[PDB]
Structure 1
C-alpha cells in the first residue's frame, strides 16, 4: 500500500527479478506484480523439464511463466541450457546404453539449444547458457560432467555458439555459485577470459549469490564484481538469497529464526544492496531465487526437511526488517 516497490526503488540501478514456477506465480502473484520487473524459471526451463525424452518437448509450464511475465511487462531470464544437473540420461546414451560420440552429443546439444532458444526469441533477453561448469573444490578448473567427458573441454565454446546462432540478440551468460570465494573467482575469471579471448559470444557472468550471513565478505563481493567487470562482461546477480545458516550449520530443529538472525540479515541485505547500487554501472539485474519465505529451495537444501528465511518478505508476504534496509540504500 504505502510500501515502496523494489523495481521502482532500483529503477535507475538494475532490474529486480524473482525465480518462479506456475504454482508460486499464483501463490505470490501480488508480490510479483508489485515489486519485480524480471522473472526466471526456478526449474521449468532446465533440460529435464523441456526435453524429458528425445524429441518430446514439454514447454507448457515454461510457456505459462513467459506468458505471465509478458502480460505484466517483466523481462525474462532463461535458465538454463547446459548443466551437469537436471539433464536426463538419454542425452548422453545411445540405444545400447553406452555413451554417445562427441559429434552425436553436439548434435543433441545444438538441437536442444536451437529448439528452446528459438521458441522464446524476442521474449527472453538472456540465457544462462552454461551453468556451474567450474569446479567448486580441488585444484582442477572444470567440474567433471558427461557433457565435458564426451565432448571435451570445448563443449562450452560450442554451447555459446549454438545459442548465439539461435538468438544473436540474446545476452549469453556463464552462471555459477560461490562466485566470490577467491579461489573459485579466479577459475571463473580464467574460464571466461579464455572464451572471450577466443571470440566466443559470452556477454555476461551470472553471480548466483547463494549467500549466508557471514560468507562471502563484502570485500570478497567487491573484489569479485571488479574482477568480473574487468573482462568487459555485464553482471547479473541471478539467484540471490541470504541463508540463516552457514554451510557448517546443519541444524534441523529451529522453528523460527532468532531475533539476532533477523537483525543480522537486515544489516547484511543493507550492505549487499549498497554495494550493488555502488556498482550500478556494471550490475544490470538482481534476481532473488524466490521472493518470500513461504517458498524457498533452502528449506530442503543443503538439509532436507527444515525451514529457512532467506528473502525480503516473510511467509505472510509482509516486509521483513531486511526489506527496509535494502530499499533505503
Structure 2
C-alpha cells in the first residue's frame, strides 16, 4: 500500500470519495479510511431508531463518535437519514392507546426529531438524506406505502424538507433512493423531485444509492439517469455504491469465494462506472461506497441471509482488488 494511489486524491478534481461506517468498522478499517476517503456516512447510527429509540430519549453517542472521527481527519459527513419507512420505532406513529396519531401530531414529532438531530450536527454535517426511498419500487403507483404517508398525507415530504431547511439552511438536502436507473422508477423519482422543486421546496440534490450488480443497470441506463436528474438543476451524489457478485435472481449460498470471471467482470464494471462518473464530474459531487473493504458489507446478509459477497474495491485483508486498479485509472 505504500505506493498505492489514494482514492480521494485521484478524484480530487472530480468528487469526494466516501465510505459508510459504524464505530466498530472505523476501528477495524481505520487505516483504509484514513488513506482513501474524505467523506463519511453512518451506515446505521443516524437513522431514526438509533437516534430517538423512545420519545424524548435521544442516543447520540454512536453518531457522535462517527462525527468525531470524520472531523479529526478532515472528512466531510453525509447525514443518513431522517424520514424513511424503515428503521423507525413504532412509538413515532402511535398514541397512548396504541392507535395511530393524527397528521398534526406526527408533523410535530417529525419536526422535533429533525430539528433536534440537524441542529446538533449543524456546521459538521454538510448534507442530509431527508427523505429515503419514498418512491414505489414496484407497481404503477408513484409512492410506496408508509406510516408517514398514511398519517400525514402525500405532502409529508414537502414538510420534511421544509423542517430540515429551517433547522440548517446551509445544508444540502437530498431525496435518496435505489434502483434509481431503471427507466420506470427513474421517471417516478424525476417526476417527484420536479414537482417538489416546482413548488419551491428546498430539495437540493438527488442521492443515487447505486446498489448495483455486475449487469444491472446498464451503462446507458446510468448515463440516462444522471442526465435526467441533472436536468432538474440538482446536485448529484452516488450515495451507497457497491457492486454485488450476485444478480437479483441469484440467491445461491454455496459460493465460498468469487470466481476469477466474477472478479474480472467486477473490475471491468467498476472501471466503466467510474469512467462514466468522471465524465459527469460537473454534476456529480460525491461518490460514497456502502463500506470500504469486503470484510464488512450488508450484502453478506441481504437479500440472502448468511452468505458472503465481495462488492468493494478492497478485499477482506484490506488489499486492493483488480477493481481498484481499473477504478483509479480512468
Deviation by residue 1:188-219 (Cα, 9 ceiling, x = unmatched): 00000000000000000000000000000000
Q: CA deviation at 1:50?
A: 0.0
SS in 1 for 2:179: coil
Q: CA deviation at 1:313?
A: 0.1
Deviation by residue 1:120-177 (Cα, 9 ceiling, x = unmatched): 0000000000000000000000000000000000000000000000000000000000
Separation (CA, whole Å) in 2 of partners of 1:79 and 1:138 = 26
Separation (CA, whole Å) in 2 of partners of 1:276 and 1:81 = 27
Q: CA deviation at 1:94?
A: 0.0
Deviation by residue 1:1-40 (Cα, 9 ceiling, x = unmatched): 1000000000000000000000000000000000000000
SS in 2 for 1:23: helix
| Match in the other structure for 1:18 | 19
Q: CA deviation at 1:236?
A: 0.2
Separation (CA, whole Å) in 2 of partners of 1:18 and 1:194 = 31
| Match in the other structure for 1:60 | 61
Q: CA deviation at 1:49?
A: 0.0
User: TM-score, with normalisation over the residues of structure 2?
Assistant: 1.00
Q: CA deviation at 1:80?
A: 0.1
| Match in the other structure for 2:212 | 211
Deviation by residue 1:247-295 (Cα, 9 ceiling, x = unmatched): 0000000000000000000000000000000000000000000000000
Deviation by residue 1:105-125 (Cα, 9 ceiling, x = unmatched): 000000000000000000000
SS in 2 for 1:190: helix
Separation (CA, whole Å) in 2 of partners of 1:236 and 1:122 = 20
Separation (CA, whole Å) in 2 of partners of 1:312 and 1:219 = 23
Separation (CA, whole Å) in 1 of partners of 2:173 and 2:61 = 24
| Match in the other structure for 1:126 | 127
Separation (CA, whole Å) in 2 of partners of 1:141 and 1:31 = 40
Structure 1: tracts of 5 or more residues without a match: none
Deviation by residue 1:224-258 (Cα, 9 ceiling, x = unmatched): 00000000000000000000000000000000000
Q: CA deviation at 1:57?
A: 0.1
Q: CA deviation at 1:328?
A: 0.2
Separation (CA, whole Å) in 1 of partners of 2:98 and 2:121 = 32
> What RMSD over aligned residues (CA atoms) do the two structures have, in Å?
0.1
Separation (CA, whole Å) in 1 of partners of 2:49 and 2:105 = 18
| Match in the other structure for 1:286 | 287
Moved over 6 A (4+): none
| Match in the other structure for 2:243 | 242
SS in 1 for 2:19: strand
Deviation by residue 1:92-112 (Cα, 9 ceiling, x = unmatched): 000000000000000000000
Separation (CA, whole Å) in 2 of partners of 1:207 and 1:315 = 26
How many residues were matched structurally? 329
Separation (CA, whole Å) in 2 of partners of 1:19 and 1:167 = 23
Separation (CA, whole Å) in 2 of partners of 1:161 and 1:253 = 48
